[PDB]
Amino acid sequence: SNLPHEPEFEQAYKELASTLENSTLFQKNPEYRKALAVVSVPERVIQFRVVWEDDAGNVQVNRGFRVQFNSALGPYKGGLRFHPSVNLSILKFLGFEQIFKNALTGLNMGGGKGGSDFDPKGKSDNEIRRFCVSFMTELCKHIGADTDVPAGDIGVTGREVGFLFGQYRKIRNQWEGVLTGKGGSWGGSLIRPEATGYGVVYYVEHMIAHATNGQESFKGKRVAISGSGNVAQYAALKVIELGGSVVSLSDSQGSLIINGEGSFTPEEIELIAQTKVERKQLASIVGAAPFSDANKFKYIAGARPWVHVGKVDVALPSATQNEISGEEAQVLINAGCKFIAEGSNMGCTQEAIDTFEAHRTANAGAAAIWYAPGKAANAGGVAVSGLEMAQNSARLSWTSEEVDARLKDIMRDCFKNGLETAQEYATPAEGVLPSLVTGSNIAGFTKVAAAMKDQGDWW
Amino acid sequence: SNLPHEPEFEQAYKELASTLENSTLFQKNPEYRKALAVVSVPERVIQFRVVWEDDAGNVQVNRGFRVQFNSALGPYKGGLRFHPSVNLSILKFLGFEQIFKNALTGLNMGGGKGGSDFDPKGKSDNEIRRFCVSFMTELCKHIGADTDVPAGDIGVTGREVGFLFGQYRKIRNQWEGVLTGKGGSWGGSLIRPEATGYGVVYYVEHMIAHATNGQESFKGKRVAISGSGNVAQYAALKVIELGGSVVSLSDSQGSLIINGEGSFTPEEIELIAQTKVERKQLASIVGAAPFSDANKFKYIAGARPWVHVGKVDVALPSATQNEISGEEAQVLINAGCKFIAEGSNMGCTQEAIDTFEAHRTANAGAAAIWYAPGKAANAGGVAVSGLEMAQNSARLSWTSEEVDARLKDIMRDCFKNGLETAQEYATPAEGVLPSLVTGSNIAGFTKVAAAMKDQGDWW
Amino acid sequence: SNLPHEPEFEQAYKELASTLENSTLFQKNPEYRKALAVVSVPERVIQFRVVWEDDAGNVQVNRGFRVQFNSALGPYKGGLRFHPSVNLSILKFLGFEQIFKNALTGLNMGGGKGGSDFDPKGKSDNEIRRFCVSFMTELCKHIGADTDVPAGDIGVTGREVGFLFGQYRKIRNQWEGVLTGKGGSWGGSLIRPEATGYGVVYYVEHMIAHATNGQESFKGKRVAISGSGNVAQYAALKVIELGGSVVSLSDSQGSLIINGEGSFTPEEIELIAQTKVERKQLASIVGAAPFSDANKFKYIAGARPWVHVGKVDVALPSATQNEISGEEAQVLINAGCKFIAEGSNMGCTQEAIDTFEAHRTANAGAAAIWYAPGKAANAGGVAVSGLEMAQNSARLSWTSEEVDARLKDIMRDCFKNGLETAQEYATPAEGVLPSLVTGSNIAGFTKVAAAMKDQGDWW
Ligand SMILES: NC(=O)C1=CN([C@@H]2O[C@H](COP(=O)(O)OP(=O)(O)OC[C@H]3O[C@@H](n4cnc5c(N)ncnc54)[C@H](OP(=O)(O)O)[C@@H]3O)[C@@H](O)[C@H]2O)C=CC1
Ligand SMILES: NC(=O)C1=CN([C@@H]2O[C@H](COP(=O)(O)OP(=O)(O)OC[C@H]3O[C@@H](n4cnc5c(N)ncnc54)[C@H](OP(=O)(O)O)[C@@H]3O)[C@@H](O)[C@H]2O)C=CC1
Ligand SMILES: NC(=O)C1=CN([C@@H]2O[C@H](COP(=O)(O)OP(=O)(O)OC[C@H]3O[C@@H](n4cnc5c(N)ncnc54)[C@H](OP(=O)(O)O)[C@@H]3O)[C@@H](O)[C@H]2O)C=CC1
Numbered sequence A, B, C: 001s002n003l004p005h006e007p008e009f010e011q012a013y014k015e016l017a018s019t020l021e022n023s024t025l026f027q028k029n030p031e032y033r034k035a036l037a038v039v040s041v042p043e044r045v046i047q048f049r050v051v052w053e054d055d056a057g058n059v060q061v062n063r064g065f066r067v068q069f070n071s072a073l074g075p076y077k078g079g080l081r082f083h084p085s086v087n088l089s090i091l092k093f094l095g096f097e098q099i100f101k102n103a104l105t106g107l108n109m110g111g112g113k114g115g116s117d118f119d120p121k122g123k124s125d126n127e128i129r130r131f132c133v134s135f136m137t138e139l140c141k142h143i144g145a146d147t148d149v150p151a152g153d154i155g156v157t158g159r160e161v162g163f164l165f166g167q168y169r170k171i172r173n174q175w176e177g178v179l180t181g182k183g184g185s186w187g188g189s190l191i192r193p194e195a196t197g198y199g200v201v202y203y204v205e206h207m208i209a210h211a212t213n214g215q216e217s218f219k220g221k222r223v224a225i226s227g228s229g230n231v232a233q234y235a236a237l238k239v240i241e242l243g244g245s246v247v248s249l250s251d252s253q254g255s256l257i258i259n260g261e262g263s264f265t266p267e268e269i270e271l272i273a274q275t276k277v278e279r280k281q282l283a284s285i286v287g288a289a290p291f292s293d294a295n296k297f298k299y300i301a302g303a304r305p306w307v308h309v310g311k312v313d314v315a316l317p318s319a320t321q322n323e324i325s326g327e328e329a330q331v332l333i334n335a336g337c338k339f340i341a342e343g344s345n346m347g348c349t350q351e352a353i354d355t356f357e358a359h360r361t362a363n364a365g366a367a368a369i370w371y372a373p374g375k376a377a378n379a380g381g382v383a384v385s386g387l388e389m390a391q392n393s394a395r396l397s398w399t400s401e402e403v404d405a406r407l408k409d410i411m412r413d414c415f416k417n418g419l420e421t422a423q424e425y426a427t428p429a430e431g432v433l434p435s436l437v438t439g440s441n442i443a444g445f446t447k448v449a450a451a452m453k454d455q456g457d458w459w
């Protein structure tokens, strides 16, 4: 009767719900409508005040959150976002998505998300430390290795994970896998930094192989990426390793595009990584080598990369939600883009999704642009967090090769599940690619819904 | 301003600190001096009264301790010592060492140590049971499988571990890996009894192979060992298995030396083991066969074995701290000893260490006596305890061969790390052996210090 | 066998033990020797590292302690001392005393003591806040309204209690009487600030009334006080209210003596109170009015007040332990002092006590100087803390008059108990005053010892 407006959450919900309705799911099992009503209300939300001291001795106040959305498949799992936009609506969209993403990994992880409106930009490392100490002082009451296992989303790196982990141990007096994205000597997993970007690229490899009947791969393709943080960096590295070209990165202030044919180099990605560790903008490094080379790089203030990259074969938005508009989607199609996968959560606007999906239904086979939703394509991060949990519970670390192999198998299974599910419940016209968004949504949702029923959450 | 004098702890600290100062560590990273000040104050110490009833019905009072020194790398881990010398100073030296030893294993274990001034000698098994029951009644508030995992050091065998484990389960109502050194049917690990002695010998094998360019091994070498408990027994067995000769054992009342050329036999080690299970002295068994054979054995009351064994190639003090004096170190050098490794914690006096290290810097290659500190060489015990924890968390036991293989890999990695670290930070003159004490200390310390920084313990 | 030297604790123990031996206690009940051995080993001690951030952003490290000595009569109870001298020995002397003091109040409070070597002098309020936050972050694991209830001893005021209480609530998520000395709006008791000083004076009133057969009182008497903190301030105020003269106060840097006949005024005590709130020395206020008036005040740097006050009738050391030497005791006797009561814990050296007691046995009636130990005379503070606990458990505050009346009854009962106990177990020669130190010690000890036996601590 009197619920507040939560636009981001409503967007995520509406897209999921629409894909479920536009299938035979509720014809065969109309009772699953009850599951949808129940699943869409989070099990628990904690909000709390975070008072912390700045370097001048002043009192500062921020808001802390943890949404514990669903635990049918496992303990709550998902990142912490420290960004000035953060509110309950955003964290609910993220936590809702997380439920179904986690289901697609095949691991036992429920969905959650948290964070704060604290803005790490402009803060000293000391200020970030004090903030994390205050934040976890409250959060540690509500989380635990078999309860809720956070990690780092936007604004939360290994640095923040460390300060958070330290304070948890201090209060709780237990050394356990309560956070993932931990450091190598204190319970971290090899491949976790790489996991999301690598996984997105692994997933798109299956998309390319399927759409082109094994004729094409990333070798020789031009890939536009947005963001320049954890997901963007490692997606870029994997593309390069597979012989593809990375033709854009961006941040909140502008885009850094490759001028003509060519690619970001691993060395350049490393320099950008070090800049971002220091919480600096791409704009701050384009006045010196190598990024001042105007024949290789064009910095465009205030722009997203999509309309400025020219011809592209693959688009991997890897920054933030709603970062590909309807217009930009049409431009990418016109630029020859045949593959778009979300590194970022809810990276595409609804207008963009509708554009990509309309295009898929109008164009046979490899002529279609194929859209993969984040809950499928970006699941590598949380999957590898699941493996970090597994390693922590075994008290033994695995090799890079072991973790990467499992990650590859998970991304393959996720792709196949979404493809086959779409084929069965939302069968496309002959020659048309099945909807990976529809298939992924149905596959994630039904697994969760049935587990919920088994456990008496609904009946 | 008004801190008490803790001689053993101060000794351990001073030796660590000196080795760090005599390197390039603080030239490259002077901030690590802050880490040293923080790490050297234990996170937590619990002391408690232990009232227990003797077989006559009398009230008896002893003191109980658990030092929880550092948890950056994992839950607190280290043994319990029941010996009349026990006090906070001793347990702090042991727990401080434990931090860096544990770091060298590559497993996620923090450093701790505890115990009591209770003297098991002269007690009935019933008295030991009542004492352990009382002791754990308090200790169980402070320990746990993800918090602090004790085990048996001097005076604490599988018998005491059993009584302790029983009482923990009774109160806490959890069956978990809270202690290691457990029995085979109730969560123990194969190879744990053997682990420390085997590991010391494994480590020395790498020392011999490196110093002699693969030309020598334990085959044909004469090895003087002190103590006759868990570490000494299994070190002796491994030496014998590798074709070496064990020419001494000792206890608190005297030494039992091999008279001439020859060795303790596995059968004789077993008889000594059974004597020690009964808490009897070596002096009590030399009046009968086989130990009354004066052509094989000489019992020397009140003596350590070092000056009485004649020519020796390897010395493995395996009893207690400060059991090789400056004089005894010179005698071992004069007797041709080229390898000395601590089975016992802080087995060498500082005078001994200085003598061994001066000798190493004065003599090229295989001419030097090479000293390996306990934190490197005796780490096999705690390593295998880590694997017992891993097995308990998996709910499945491993084979003897699996545990032993991992132990071998751990001792190899520990040796290599200490060797290469010494080579990099405290580079010896050409032809001179790198300092394993310096390398081990730097390698353990930096790993802990950096994890502490990551977790906000210092900044 | 290998226990560390704890001089202050040994002093407290030896004096108690001597008074018990010099009585008929162990003739009638020799089994109580067993009780003494058990009671003298603390039930539990927690020590912990306290890392805190100074105003420059530097890491600082101090040591934290809580001695939980005895809980036969109630939850552990006693103050926190923040002073650079603090170590385990000091806190054990204090906690040991606390057991028997608490027993004499008639309330259900066990004995404990804690604190830190942190020195509040030279720190900002912000630094003190950060220190208290860090300190309680660990201490809150070990204390609670029905477990252990600390409060403020030397260096710990209502300010520090507030910061400590805040952090406890933050972590533990319980609002309860875990600390006493709390503020008026957040669970404090009327009369708690006044309690110790008032109580000392109340107790001495009974001493005067008894020794002089009701002929004298505080009216017209000259009272030398040491210290200028909580105990000294309110002892001074009560003396003034009863028509006595306060002729000295002191701090760690010197004494401020009344020059001739006259008294500190309540207004002057208030100014000194405000100076001490700011953590400043008496030396800093003698350069201005009213304390620059050399006809009223003499400031003597580096001196205790005892030899500089001339003729005095009552001495109330109210600063710290061992602050009246053997010499100073003889001087006070020579100055006509007939009443000495410890505001401070273990205020008198053993030499002083022996001097006062020898004098009592050599001089009949009112000719003797009468010594009252702190465990009797300074018990008003902890008694009123007991009433603060009672008020917190009732969820209702009492009036100033209610609390003060109970305090008066408690001090009367304590005096009577010590007097009558001395009369029964250590009967003085006819005309000689009974030993209040002996009587107080026996009365406190037997109550605790018998409760311990009832509860199975010894048998
Ligand atoms: N890390 C992981 O494992 C997972 C991440 N994701 C999602 O990937 C995306 C990126 O996360 P991640 O790389 O880890 O985060 P990072 O903080 O490391 O990087 C985020 C990047 O996106 C930019 N960005 C963030 N918010 C905005 C915004 N409101 N407007 C414009 N630009 C913005 C940032 O620019 P700037 O520096 O200027 O602010 C930065 O370049 C997110 O949507 C995240 O939820 C999905 C699955 C796993
Ligand atoms: N057990 C393990 O896994 C580990 C042990 N260590 C260290 O190895 C050493 C031996 O431990 P462990 O074998 O397990 O213990 P045990 O109790 O099984 O045996 C100890 C041996 O050393 C003698 N000993 C102990 N204390 C003294 C003392 N003050 N003076 C003279 N002799 C003494 C004992 O003689 P007696 O019987 O007469 O008292 C006994 O022979 C210790 O320093 C221990 O800390 C190091 C790493 C792992
Ligand atoms: N507060 C209470 O309710 C109780 C207190 N006590 C005892 O009363 C005595 C005073 O405590 P309290 O008034 O509360 O504490 P405060 O900190 O308020 O005042 C302590 C006074 O004693 C001085 N002082 C403290 N330590 C030393 C030292 N080593 N050497 C010289 N002077 C020193 C201080 O001088 P400066 O400022 O220069 O350091 C100050 O004037 C202590 O012995 C305490 O244990 C006994 C029963 C109850």
Ligand SMILES: O=C(O)c1cccc(C(=O)O)c1
Residues within 6 Å of the ligand: A077, A078, A079, A080, A098, A101, A149, A150, A151, A152, A153, A180, A181, A345, A378, A379, A381, A382, A385
């Ligand atoms: O649980 C995680 O490791 C994690 C961290 C950051 C983002 C995500 C996500 O799936 O969006 C998960």
Ligand SMILES: O=C(O)c1cccc(C(=O)O)c1
Residues within 6 Å of the ligand: B077, B078, B079, B080, B098, B101, B149, B150, B151, B152, B153, B180, B181, B345, B378, B379, B381, B382, B385
């Ligand atoms: O943790 C252990 O298993 C243990 C037991 C005895 C000694 C030691 C040690 O490293 O000294 C560890």
Ligand SMILES: O=C(O)c1cccc(C(=O)O)c1
Residues within 6 Å of the ligand: C077, C078, C079, C080, C098, C101, C149, C150, C151, C152, C153, C180, C181, C345, C378, C379, C381, C382, C385
């Ligand atoms: O428990 C208390 O309130 C307290 C505070 C300060 C000192 C004392 C004491 O008895 O010495 C008690």
